[PDB]
Design an enzyme around this catalytic site. Structure first.
Site, PDB file in Angstrom:
ATOM      1  N   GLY A 117     -21.744 -39.079   1.812  1.00 37.59           N
ATOM      2  CA  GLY A 117     -20.568 -38.753   1.026  1.00 37.59           C
ATOM      3  C   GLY A 117     -20.645 -39.383  -0.335  1.00 37.59           C
ATOM      4  CG  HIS A 176     -29.759 -37.837   0.889  1.00 34.62           C
ATOM      5  ND1 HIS A 176     -28.549 -37.612   0.268  1.00 34.62           N
ATOM      6  CD2 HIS A 176     -30.530 -36.761   0.616  1.00 34.62           C
ATOM      7  CE1 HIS A 176     -28.578 -36.442  -0.339  1.00 34.62           C
ATOM      8  NE2 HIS A 176     -29.768 -35.903  -0.144  1.00 34.62           N
ATOM      9  CG  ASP A 231     -30.893 -32.418  -1.398  1.00 37.55           C
ATOM     10  OD1 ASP A 231     -30.578 -33.615  -1.403  1.00 37.55           O
ATOM     11  OD2 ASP A 231     -30.613 -31.632  -2.300  1.00 37.55           O
TER      12      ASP A 231
HETATM   13  C1  LIG Z   1     -20.092 -37.122  -5.715  1.00 31.54           C
HETATM   14  C2  LIG Z   1     -21.051 -36.964  -4.488  1.00 31.54           C
HETATM   15  C3  LIG Z   1     -20.640 -36.228  -3.115  1.00 31.54           C
HETATM   16  C4  LIG Z   1     -19.235 -35.595  -2.888  1.00 31.54           C
HETATM   17  C5  LIG Z   1     -21.640 -36.125  -1.968  1.00 31.54           C
HETATM   18  C6  LIG Z   1     -23.020 -36.721  -2.155  1.00 31.54           C
HETATM   19  C7  LIG Z   1     -23.469 -37.440  -3.455  1.00 31.54           C
HETATM   20  C8  LIG Z   1     -24.920 -38.050  -3.602  1.00 31.54           C
HETATM   21  C9  LIG Z   1     -22.480 -37.562  -4.626  1.00 31.54           C
HETATM   22  O1  LIG Z   1     -22.866 -38.216  -5.825  1.00 31.54           O
HETATM   23  C10 LIG Z   1     -24.025 -36.601  -0.996  1.00 31.54           C
HETATM   24  C11 LIG Z   1     -23.628 -35.868   0.382  1.00 31.54           C
HETATM   25  C12 LIG Z   1     -22.234 -35.284   0.550  1.00 31.54           C
HETATM   26  C13 LIG Z   1     -22.088 -36.059   1.775  1.00 31.54           C
HETATM   27  C14 LIG Z   1     -22.461 -33.786   0.807  1.00 31.54           C
HETATM   28  C15 LIG Z   1     -22.192 -33.086   2.153  1.00 31.54           C
HETATM   29  C16 LIG Z   1     -21.740 -31.568   2.164  1.00 31.54           C
HETATM   30  C17 LIG Z   1     -21.536 -30.658   0.861  1.00 31.54           C
HETATM   31  C18 LIG Z   1     -22.745 -30.583  -0.025  1.00 31.54           C
HETATM   32  C19 LIG Z   1     -21.088 -29.234   1.342  1.00 31.54           C
HETATM   33  C20 LIG Z   1     -21.847 -27.952   0.928  1.00 31.54           C
HETATM   34  C21 LIG Z   1     -21.226 -26.740   1.524  1.00 31.54           C
HETATM   35  C22 LIG Z   1     -21.813 -25.279   1.287  1.00 31.54           C
HETATM   36  C23 LIG Z   1     -23.066 -25.171   0.436  1.00 31.54           C
HETATM   37  C24 LIG Z   1     -22.147 -24.458   2.616  1.00 31.54           C
HETATM   38  C25 LIG Z   1     -21.940 -24.992   4.023  1.00 31.54           C
HETATM   39  C26 LIG Z   1     -20.568 -24.705   4.774  1.00 31.54           C
HETATM   40  C27 LIG Z   1     -20.551 -23.458   5.785  1.00 31.54           C
HETATM   41  C28 LIG Z   1     -19.191 -23.318   6.490  1.00 31.54           C
HETATM   42  C29 LIG Z   1     -20.767 -22.065   5.071  1.00 31.54           C
HETATM   43  O2  LIG Z   1     -21.239 -35.431  -0.671  1.00 31.54           O
END
Ligand SMILES: Cc1c(C)c2c(c(C)c1O)CC[C@](C)(CCC[C@@H](C)CCC[C@@H](C)CCCC(C)C)O2
Ligand SMILES: Cc1c(C)c2c(c(C)c1O)CC[C@](C)(CCC[C@@H](C)CCC[C@@H](C)CCCC(C)C)O2
Lengths: 121, 121
Positions: A29, A47, A89
């Site tokens: 997150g 990650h 990723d």
């Molecule tokens: C500011 C910030 C955020 C908010 C963040 C991360 C980082 C490095 C950041 O600097 C890493 C991981 C994650 C935990 C991301 C986890 C999930 C998102 C990328 C969701 C993408 C959703 C789309 C495509 C499709 C999938 C959903 C299905 C229902 C179609 O959130």
């Protein structure tokens, strides 16, 4: 970018990326890293460290190309940073999938504060 | 930074930030903006636009100080960008709280494809 990342996680884990990993443990997150709560969380920890190595691209905003081939994330050439990014990723999606077994919903919206400082990458 | 934003949101709303706003509608949490689905989502839209107005600081990374005084978020910055940043955060936190009345859990994890193009900030 988060879109590819999310998609990969979705693809590897079969789980809604945001729901399960948008905010999990101390590392999945926003808000940098923290002592990992568990394997899943460690994936995100690794990650974020992976992202630290990048140079030349925005892990969050820069979209890149990758393909789903033989049910495997295959990073497109893109450019070095984007390919590295893509590999970061892809690694975390794979990792999350491998550790889906110990995924713990209790860590889902873990409060970033109740996270011990993470070791330097 | 998100640390202060998250804290403000929790303080104002009393709700776990990631849980209620980590992925809500077209603008809360999600990457980018989208036509707001409702007032809560509008708060995030406004917040993102507020962020776009900042010039000398990173809204995601830059920490700033603020205090909780008389149960009010009181930004404690003089630097114009950090002050504005703090104020953007304070505003969304307040706004999210002011709109808890029409907060709708069905917008949690709202699928981006359903989002209509956001008006330009
Ligand atoms: C500011 C910030 C955020 C908010 C963040 C991360 C980082 C490095 C950041 O600097 C890493 C991981 C994650 C935990 C991301 C986890 C999930 C998102 C990328 C969701 C993408 C959703 C789309 C495509 C499709 C999938 C959903 C299905 C229902 C179609 O959130
Ligand atoms: C990139 C980006 C993200 C990710 C984002 C928003 C905007 C404008 C962005 O440009 C607005 C709202 C939100 C949806 C808010 C999500 C909340 C997180 C910031 C919370 C971290 C919460 C912790 C600290 C609270 C507990 C701390 C105690 C000390 C009180 O997420």
């Amino acid at each position: 970018s988060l879109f590819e990342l999310g998609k990969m996680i979705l693809q590897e884990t079969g789980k809604n990326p945001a729901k399960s990993y948008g905010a999990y443990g101390c590392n999945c997150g926003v808000l940098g890293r923290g002592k990992p709560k568990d394997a899943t969380d460690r994936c995100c920890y690794v990650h974020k460290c992976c992202y630290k190595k990048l140079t030349g691209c925005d892990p969050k905003k820069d979209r890149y190309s990758y393909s789903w081939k033989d049910k495997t994330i295959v990073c497109g050439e893109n450019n070095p940073c984007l390919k590295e990014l893509c590999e970061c990723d892809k690694a975390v999606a794979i990792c999350l999938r491998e550790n889906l077994g110990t995924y713990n919903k209790k860590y889902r919206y873990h409060l970033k504060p109740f996270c011990k400082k993470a070791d330097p990458c």
